[PDB]
Write an enzyme that holds these catalytic residues in place. Sequence first.
Site, mmCIF file in Angstrom:
data_model
loop_
_atom_site.group_PDB
_atom_site.id
_atom_site.type_symbol
_atom_site.label_atom_id
_atom_site.label_comp_id
_atom_site.label_asym_id
_atom_site.label_seq_id
_atom_site.Cartn_x
_atom_site.Cartn_y
_atom_site.Cartn_z
ATOM 1 N N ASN A 43 -9.434 9.683 31.560
ATOM 2 C CA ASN A 43 -8.999 9.301 30.180
ATOM 3 C C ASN A 43 -7.907 10.048 29.706
ATOM 4 O O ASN A 43 -8.027 11.415 29.853
ATOM 5 C CB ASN A 43 -10.222 9.770 29.184
ATOM 6 C CG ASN A 43 -9.763 9.256 27.934
ATOM 7 O OD1 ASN A 43 -10.505 9.550 26.507
ATOM 8 N ND2 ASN A 43 -8.893 8.189 27.514
ATOM 9 N N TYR A 76 -0.990 5.108 17.226
ATOM 10 C CA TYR A 76 -2.068 5.939 17.195
ATOM 11 C C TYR A 76 -1.651 7.268 16.265
ATOM 12 O O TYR A 76 -0.443 7.991 16.351
ATOM 13 C CB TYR A 76 -2.181 6.564 18.650
ATOM 14 C CG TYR A 76 -3.057 7.555 18.662
ATOM 15 C CD1 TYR A 76 -4.420 7.545 18.480
ATOM 16 C CD2 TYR A 76 -3.014 8.974 19.375
ATOM 17 C CE1 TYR A 76 -5.463 8.491 18.578
ATOM 18 C CE2 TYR A 76 -3.742 9.777 19.654
ATOM 19 C CZ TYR A 76 -4.947 9.601 19.251
ATOM 20 O OH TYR A 76 -6.163 10.685 19.508
ATOM 21 N N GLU A 85 -9.087 8.813 12.590
ATOM 22 C CA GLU A 85 -8.225 8.287 13.860
ATOM 23 C C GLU A 85 -7.943 7.047 13.696
ATOM 24 O O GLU A 85 -9.235 6.289 13.708
ATOM 25 C CB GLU A 85 -8.950 9.026 15.249
ATOM 26 C CG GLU A 85 -8.476 8.662 16.191
ATOM 27 C CD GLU A 85 -9.124 8.899 17.814
ATOM 28 O OE1 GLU A 85 -10.275 8.707 17.495
ATOM 29 O OE2 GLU A 85 -8.627 9.471 18.486
ATOM 30 N N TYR A 87 -5.724 3.392 14.937
ATOM 31 C CA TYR A 87 -5.027 2.494 15.895
ATOM 32 C C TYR A 87 -4.516 1.203 15.522
ATOM 33 O O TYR A 87 -5.302 0.564 14.675
ATOM 34 C CB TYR A 87 -5.756 2.159 17.390
ATOM 35 C CG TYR A 87 -6.559 3.440 17.702
ATOM 36 C CD1 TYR A 87 -7.540 3.936 17.276
ATOM 37 C CD2 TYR A 87 -6.044 4.186 19.062
ATOM 38 C CE1 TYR A 87 -8.341 5.003 17.929
ATOM 39 C CE2 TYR A 87 -6.840 5.221 19.273
ATOM 40 C CZ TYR A 87 -7.939 5.801 18.769
ATOM 41 O OH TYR A 87 -8.517 6.839 19.310
ATOM 42 N N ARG A 121 -17.070 8.130 14.980
ATOM 43 C CA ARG A 121 -17.282 8.806 16.277
ATOM 44 C C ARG A 121 -18.069 10.073 16.040
ATOM 45 O O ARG A 121 -17.878 10.941 15.151
ATOM 46 C CB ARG A 121 -15.785 9.373 16.665
ATOM 47 C CG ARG A 121 -14.671 8.247 16.902
ATOM 48 C CD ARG A 121 -15.063 7.513 18.246
ATOM 49 N NE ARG A 121 -14.791 8.670 19.479
ATOM 50 C CZ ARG A 121 -15.113 8.288 20.666
ATOM 51 N NH1 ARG A 121 -15.770 7.213 21.073
ATOM 52 N NH2 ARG A 121 -14.689 9.138 21.677
ATOM 53 N N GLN A 135 -13.008 5.885 12.786
ATOM 54 C CA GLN A 135 -12.083 5.416 13.550
ATOM 55 C C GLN A 135 -11.688 4.087 13.081
ATOM 56 O O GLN A 135 -12.522 3.098 12.962
ATOM 57 C CB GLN A 135 -12.626 5.392 14.818
ATOM 58 C CG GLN A 135 -11.507 5.360 15.998
ATOM 59 C CD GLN A 135 -12.007 5.242 17.286
ATOM 60 O OE1 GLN A 135 -12.957 4.519 17.668
ATOM 61 N NE2 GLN A 135 -11.814 6.341 18.333
ATOM 62 N N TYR A 170 -0.183 13.596 12.637
ATOM 63 C CA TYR A 170 0.652 13.052 13.493
ATOM 64 C C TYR A 170 0.654 11.417 13.571
ATOM 65 O O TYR A 170 -0.318 10.958 13.024
ATOM 66 C CB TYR A 170 0.747 13.504 14.882
ATOM 67 C CG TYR A 170 -0.403 13.243 15.872
ATOM 68 C CD1 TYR A 170 -0.676 12.001 16.416
ATOM 69 C CD2 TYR A 170 -1.431 14.388 16.225
ATOM 70 C CE1 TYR A 170 -1.656 11.831 17.452
ATOM 71 C CE2 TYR A 170 -2.322 13.947 16.943
ATOM 72 C CZ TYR A 170 -2.703 12.951 17.767
ATOM 73 O OH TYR A 170 -3.477 12.690 18.516
ATOM 74 N N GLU A 176 -2.554 4.854 26.375
ATOM 75 C CA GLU A 176 -3.759 5.146 26.654
ATOM 76 C C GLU A 176 -4.405 4.649 28.074
ATOM 77 O O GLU A 176 -4.050 3.344 28.434
ATOM 78 C CB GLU A 176 -4.839 5.036 25.705
ATOM 79 C CG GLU A 176 -6.244 5.704 26.171
ATOM 80 C CD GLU A 176 -7.273 4.796 26.444
ATOM 81 O OE1 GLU A 176 -6.765 3.746 27.495
ATOM 82 O OE2 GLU A 176 -8.397 4.868 26.361
#
Length: 189
Positions: A43, A76, A85, A87, A121, A135, A170, A176
């Site tokens: 990963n 991301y 988190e 996406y 998560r 997430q 960030y 990924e």
Amino acid sequence: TIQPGTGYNNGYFYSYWNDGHGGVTYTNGPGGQFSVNWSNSGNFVGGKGWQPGTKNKVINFSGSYNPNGNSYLSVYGWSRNPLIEYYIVENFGTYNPSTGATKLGEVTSDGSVYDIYRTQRVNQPSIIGTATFYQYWSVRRNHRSSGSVNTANHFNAWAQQGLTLGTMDYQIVAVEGYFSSGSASITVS
């Protein structure tokens, strides 16, 4: 060509992380360019962008994306208080990253409909160490390897679905890979 870590290169923040499994070669190029070639990796997630990101940034990207197994190309990033988190998936191979998550609705942005999801998560790595956090996902139905992403459209859609974002950490365009092979070259602006 660098090892896992974070820093700045040619005016852009960059982040490269992997699980310790090899087969990944991540390289920072001129401007907001980066390339990643992987062979039977574990990963990993790597890319360029900003630190911190904003809630209204229009992100541009272009390049070549050729995965052979689980992988995705997406905006991301993270926020703190609340720790999130998120996406905005523009393209992916073999596995829809939102799999298993709860669908909250949909949003039409930058020429395509995106499916919105939320999932928790539990005790997973994060920008502040091991933790439990939510997430958020926006998965583009029409996959693409270049274009512009008005992040505000997605954050506002998520907010509409009750998905609050904290202070931005960030924000990058990253590639990924999850136990697969592939190659990609992306320029961010």
